[PDB]
Design a protein around this ligand. Sequence first.
Ligand SMILES: Nc1nc2c(ncn2[C@@H]2O[C@H](COP(=O)(O)OP(=O)(O)O)[C@@H](O)[C@H]2O)c(=O)[nH]1
Ligand SMILES: [Mg+2]
Lengths: 67, 428
Amino acid sequence: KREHEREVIQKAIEENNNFIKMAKEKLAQKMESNKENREAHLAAMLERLQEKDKHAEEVRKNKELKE
Amino acid sequence: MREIVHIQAGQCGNQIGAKFWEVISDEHGIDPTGSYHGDSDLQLERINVYYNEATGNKYVPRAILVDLEPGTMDSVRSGPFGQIFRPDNFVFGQSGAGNNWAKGHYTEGAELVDSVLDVVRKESESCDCLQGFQLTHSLGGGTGSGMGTLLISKIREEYPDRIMNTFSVMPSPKVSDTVVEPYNATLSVHQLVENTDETYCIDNEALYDICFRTLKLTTPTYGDLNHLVSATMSGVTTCLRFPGQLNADLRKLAVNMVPFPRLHFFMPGFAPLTSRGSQQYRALTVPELTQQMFDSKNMMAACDPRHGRYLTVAAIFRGRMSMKEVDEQMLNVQNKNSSYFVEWIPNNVKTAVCDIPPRGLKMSATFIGNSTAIQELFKRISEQFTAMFRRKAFLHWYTGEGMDEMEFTEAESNMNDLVSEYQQYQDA
Ligand SMILES: Nc1nc2c(ncn2[C@@H]2O[C@H](COP(=O)(O)OP(=O)(O)O)[C@@H](O)[C@H]2O)c(=O)[nH]1
Ligand SMILES: [Mg+2]
């Protein structure tokens, strides 16, 4: 009986720690995946605007090479 | 053997426990100071059973008060007889047990139990000859029930040759705090069946019905219920406390009352049934005491005695009366109703008389029966347990403290075994 009582309290500690562990890890994966996605959505927007400057350079270039 | 160590656990345990010490203290002439101020010598002859003498000459209850919450123990300490208890015998945690057997038995109670056993050891060591232990608790909550049965297991390990007895309050939906009471009660019974020698079943169903139907109290409080409990308790411990021939210690009571080790759950009865404060003026005749004490309506466990058979009965008559008339009336009951007393235990009804009546009555009778009808009590709890347990309802309160469903399954099966074991002897 004493050994059984020891096992029950250990089970309870183990499950409470597992819940804390797993909540800590799911949250950290979520905050990481989110930072990455936000960043990739911004990098893509900035790249699209980068291609607009590259097209405007090329258009001014195309003007001057005509007289 | 002389000394009994008393343990009261949880809200119910400590509330009935305080009333018990109040009632027996008045009978032994002890006042709130711990000072004797009585006339008779019968009062002091066996005072050592329940009281320690510490020079004064003052009398200190051999009583340990246990809870996981401080609330009810502060109530006791500033209560009427509050000053009498040894302050070191107050053992409390802070966090409570939330009506949860698993918290009392496995998590919160485990944290507190060693401190209780230190106080038990300290009391046990001052004893010439410890008889054993009595515990007052309920089965429906978490502390009295879960921690109370933890304590019993640990007391049995450290004192395996001592008698363990309980006054156990069984829950009822009629007077109920939580839905989990049947879970807590089933888990507790499983323990009681293995680790006590004798258990007085105090049924909150019965106490409610007596208050409602018989005492004409339209809304019973705990106070009203406890008045019946403290009268029954005073009655069942009379032969332990006063000079007397039979059932005079805890082991002799067990030997006469318990024919098979598992069947040790007793139905107490009391007569006359009185309410608090309001006095009765006409004393009862010996024939009236004897008829009322055996009446289902005077039973403290809601079981119909005509639905089973009596294995053994102890009867205690209190007051100045005719012992010849007692023998005759006691003999009359048995001869009139002989089919209700098992024929394979000869002379299974024993009677004691004590001269000292309880406060406020000139005559009283207390009944202790080992009937196979007690099975009705366990069937009722079993039904309530299964209604929930088949949908596993409310179980998360228990698995959250480390328990598996298996433990519930085992506790249920053992209680069903007890039921069918009673049915075995009701038909033999
Ligand atoms: N007869 C009686 N029953 C009580 C009393 N207090 C609580 N109960 C019952 O006891 C059970 C709850 O247990 P309680 O002792 O309050 O919880 P604990 O402190 O965790 O042991 C329920 O069945 C209540 O109906 C009381 O003073 N008298
Ligand atoms: Mg309570």
